Amino acid sequence: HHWGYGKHNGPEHWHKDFPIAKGERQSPVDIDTHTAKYDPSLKPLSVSYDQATSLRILNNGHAFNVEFDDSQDKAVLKGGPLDGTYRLIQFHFHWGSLDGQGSEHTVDKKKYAAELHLVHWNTKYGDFGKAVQQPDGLAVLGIFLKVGSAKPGLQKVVDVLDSIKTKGKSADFTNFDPRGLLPESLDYWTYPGSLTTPPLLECVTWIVLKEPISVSSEQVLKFRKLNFNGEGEPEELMVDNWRPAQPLKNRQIKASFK
Ligand SMILES: CC(=O)[C@H]1CC[C@H]2[C@@H]3CC[C@@H]4C[C@H](OS(N)(=O)=O)CC[C@]4(C)[C@H]3CC[C@]12C
Ligand SMILES: [Zn+2]
């Protein structure tokens, strides 16, 4: 009886195995745009993905993960609210059963169709396993998806999903350029939070871009054809793999922009 997103094992149950679920810096949150304070001391984000080397794509039973070779200093996030350098390890998405839900963060209670998470670890902790034990261990770059025009840079991902339909399936996925998933603007909100799935560790500096990317209805429909279950198990479509907004508590959301 492992955690997931259903009625019996979903977000409202997670606290039993992971009591930090009710902690002081949980994610996601609602971003109230009028209360977020412009912080002129925040620096522009530096996203350096020119040398990113993707290796593989995996259905882990909760999402699909595009994993990168992080053996060298290549694909790095720095600047913004961050001290030091954070290395890209993987990205994944959260999405809905319908276009009207799917994002984890919300903006003035607006839910987007999906949300992309590019996950980076602080190089001062040597590897990602050690980094998640630290309050400044990870930086997750969150990007909203709305349904409209297709995102051409997403299509290589969409097309490989047929080969990883079920939990535990992986596929080689080299030479994928994550620059193709970024919006024009790097204006962002930022706050201290957590992983949004178990183990819910309070190790994330969140950086959520204001500008969504547009993806086509057909692109997101293909996400919704994946399965939470393993091959030969009862079919459970991989939809609504999002955690709802959690209490902000004693936190401030800061805006990089006026
Ligand atoms: C406990 C542990 O080993 C950590 C190290 C890296 C973490 C992973 C980093 C990448 C994503 C981040 C993701 O958090 S999120 N949704 O806020 O971006 C939770 C799942 C997973 C697989 C994480 C689960 C817990 C992992 C395996
Ligand atoms: Zn995520």
UniProtKB/Swiss-Prot annotation:
GO cellular component: apical part of cell; cytoplasm; cytosol; extracellular exosome; myelin sheath; plasma membrane
InterPro entries, sorted: CA_dom, CA_dom_sf, Carbonic_anhydrase_a-class, Carbonic_anhydrase_a-class_CS
Reported impact of N65L: Reduced activity
Effect in UniProt of substituting N60L: Reduced activity
A GO biological-process term: positive regulation of cellular pH reduction
Regulation of catalytic or functional activity: Activated by X-ray, histamine, L-adrenaline, L- and D-phenylalanine, L- and D-histidine, L-His-OMe and beta-Ala-His (carnosine).
Compartment(s) where it occurs, according to its Swiss-Prot or TrEMBL record: Cytoplasm; Cell membrane
Stated consequence of mutating A63F: Reduced activity
Enzyme class of the recorded protein, top EC level: lyase
EC number(s) recorded for this UniProt protein: 4.2.1.1, 4.2.1.69
Obligatory cofactor(s): Zn(2+); Co(2+)
Result of altering N65H: Enhanced proton transfer
Entry's family note: Belongs to the alpha-carbonic anhydrase family.
The protein, known as: Carbonic anhydrase 2
Designated gene of the protein: CA2
